[PDB]
Amino acid sequence: GGVGKIIEYFIGGGVGRYG
């Protein structure tokens, strides 16, 4: 749902990463 290392696109719309 934001920026970072580990993948987050499936939890937070598509925005990208969060690690």
Contact 14, 6 (CB under 8 A): no
DSSP code of residue 16: -
Q: What is the DSSP string of 1-19?
A: -EEEEEE-TTSSTT--E--
Residues in the chain: 19
The dihedral formed by the CA atoms of 6, 16, 10 and 5, expressed in degrees to the nearest 10: 0
Alpha carbon 13 to chain centroid, angstroms: 8
**Distance between CA atoms of residues 19 and 17, nearest Å:** 6
The dihedral formed by the CA atoms of 10, 12, 17 and 19, expressed in degrees to the nearest 10: -110
